[PDB]
Amino acid sequence: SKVTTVVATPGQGPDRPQEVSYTDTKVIGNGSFGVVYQAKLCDSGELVAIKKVLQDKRFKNRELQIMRKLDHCNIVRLRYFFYSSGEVYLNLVLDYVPETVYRVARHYSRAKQTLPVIYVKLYMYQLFRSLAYIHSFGICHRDIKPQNLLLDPDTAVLKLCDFGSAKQLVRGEPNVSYICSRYYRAPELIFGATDYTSSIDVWSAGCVLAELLLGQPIFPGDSGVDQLVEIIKVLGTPTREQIREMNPNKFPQIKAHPWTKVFRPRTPPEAIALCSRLLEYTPTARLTPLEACAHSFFDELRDPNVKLPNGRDTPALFNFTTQELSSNPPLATILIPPHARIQA
């Protein structure tokens, strides 16, 4: 059948051009940005995703610059990239990953069931690890939502993706406030703040968690006004102090709504506590990605005996690097459990 052979630049290694052949090119996503194809590498027979985007010669592609410097087991890896036509197109060859949290959470949803807590723990933890990692380089995803969380059903491994909105956030510089999707935007973004920090990613992550527990989005609405009301129903009315810290220079005064009332009965208290600590009005009061990994809701993953429902072992969860722990090294004493310290 058809066989394409291109010369590509490795994702991270030194610029030693590679010859890459692949066939079976079917489409797997469309969007303002461009297209994403699934393809099968001729040699190894491995599947890959190729993300074709328009290359605006005027500048260097920011998605590319950010992806080239990332290397983490919970982030889709960029293998090689190459330019071409279809009038200049940039093509990113990334690892192929079967499902997405969006799809998975949906199969349980239109079946009146919820994703087994053990999976919520595994997936949420890996998301937080990936955030702790990119945040250490000063990079903010800015579009954390279920659809950008890829999953391998079998291994229970999660990989963050879509860095098309990602950006190095330098304190003092302003950034557009129209990033991030409907249900997952942090309050300060809705209020149009221009000086937001990486915490917006934590708020998004919090919405993902809450969603996996509830079986539906926690803060829906077709408009900002509607989303704010849903937020206020749960967190209550923001004191002026908080409205201030969200920055932007007047709503149905409602009070504290105990989060246990929010989740199904039987929801673990720890899950509820972790939410309350992520979904906070004041951006600086939210846990950091690393602090979240060390939260008690994840203690079960730190148990020597824990196994996946299908009997296999849990993925690599403690191979932390100094880079990852840099936001707060002392945490390592919790993030890396004893049995992970046994030498032999």
Ligand SMILES: Cc1cc(C2=NC(=O)N=C(c3ccccc3)C2)ccc1O
């Ligand atoms: C299956 C798979 C998908 C992706 C996507 N990356 C992206 O930036 N954007 C994606 C997208 C898909 C549909 C519509 C819009 C964006 C998909 C990366 C690696 C993979 O292994």
